[PDB]
Write a protein that binds this ligand. Structure first.
Ligand SMILES: OC[C@H]1O[C@@H](O[C@H]2[C@H](O)[C@@H](O)[C@H](O[C@H]3[C@H](O)[C@@H](O)[C@H](O[C@H]4[C@H](O)[C@@H](O)[C@H](O[C@H]5[C@H](O)[C@@H](O)[C@H](O)O[C@@H]5CO)O[C@@H]4CO)O[C@@H]3CO)O[C@@H]2CO)[C@H](O)[C@@H](O)[C@@H]1O
Ligand code: NAG
Ligand code: CL
Ligand code: CL
Ligand code: CL
Ligand code: CU
Ligand code: NA
Length: 235
């Protein structure tokens, strides 16, 4: 159970984004139905009134929280991976539009899932904004909690992988557009019951064998990290 509070740009807090530049759902409940339109941008997908300005090469940091800002972030039990996608905003997330910018699953050295490291980062994970055409975009941050992923939702509706999905409205102002955005994958549609990473037993299969759902990260992606960039308690 987790939600996005807002974003930072180049280490500068852009302020509470909930229902303002984030298409926030009404609460922190997971999405589980892999075919639902809720997979796109969660259960309340509509245009919200603001879009955060960035330039190509900027560091965009999502900040998650559980009940209040900068709390325990997400329950520890919720091991799993974190991804970020982008699409043109005009799509409203419909069609084959989502392009992956970031994936982090399990880090062998540190022995930590992305979710574990997100807790230690105070809810903060980042991407560098790619060199796409200036204009309005949706960045879709997705946490997959795997604590009940040994079943499939479609077979047992009281279990299954959980998806915590947040869409931010981002406007890209300066960019030389050297890597125009390709077509991507649909959500819903990209993850099915047989997609690697959806059904997985984290209790008996070792984490080093986990493979995160495709698609793979776009070559035009500029990386990203899970790490605190700003101190919320100072605001
Ligand atoms: O099957 C394989 C494997 O199972 C192992 O045991 C697992 C078990 O399978 C899981 O089902 C169990 O799942 C529990 C989670 O660990 C726990 O984090 C989660 O807690 C939820 C709670 O269910 C939910 O109601 C609560 O909602 C509140 C929000 O958090 C608040 O923000 C909001 O304001 O209010 C709502 C409503 O109160 O959220 C929390 C998370 O925050 O509950 C899960 C379901 O019970 O985990 C077990 C491991 O921890 C087993 O060990 C192995 O033997 C076996 O192979
Ligand atoms: C999953 O979502 C689809 C598409 O909206 C819906 O029709 C189907 O009934 C849902 N399944 C459950 C168990 O709610
Ligand atoms: Cl749960
Ligand atoms: Cl708050
Ligand atoms: Cl809890
Ligand atoms: Cu939860
Ligand atoms: Na402002």
């Amino acid at each position: 159970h987790t939600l996005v509070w807002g974003v930072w740009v180049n280490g500068v807090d852009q302020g509470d984004g909930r229902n303002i530049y984030i298409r926030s759902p009404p609460n922190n409940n997971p999405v589980k139905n892999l075919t639902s339109p809720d997979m796109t941008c969660n259960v309340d997908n509509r245009v919200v009134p603001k879009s955060v300005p960035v330039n190509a090469g900027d560091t965009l940091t999502f900040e998650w929280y559980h009940n209040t800002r900068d709390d325990d972030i997400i329950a520890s039990s919720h091991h799993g991976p974190i991804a970020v996608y982008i699409a043109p905003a005009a799509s409203n997330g419909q069609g084959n539009v989502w392009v992956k910018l970031f994936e982090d699953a399990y880090n062998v050295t540190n022995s930590t899932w992305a979710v574990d490291r997100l807790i230690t980062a105070h809810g903060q994970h980042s991407v560098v904004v790619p060199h796409v055409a200036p204009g309005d975009y949706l960045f879709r941050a997705e946490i997959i909690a795997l604590h009940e992923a040994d079943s499939l939702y479609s077979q047992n509706p009281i279990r299954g992988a959980q998806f915590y999905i947040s869409c931010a409205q981002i406007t890209i102002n300066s960019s030389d557009d050297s890597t125009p955005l390709p077509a991507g994958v649909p959500f819903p549609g990209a993850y099915t019951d047989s997609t690697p990473g959806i059904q997985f037993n984290i209790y008996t299969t070792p984490a080093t064998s986990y493979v995160a759902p495709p698609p793979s990260v776009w070559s035009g992606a500029l990386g990203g990290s899970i790490a605190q960039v700003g101190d919320a308690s100072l605001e």
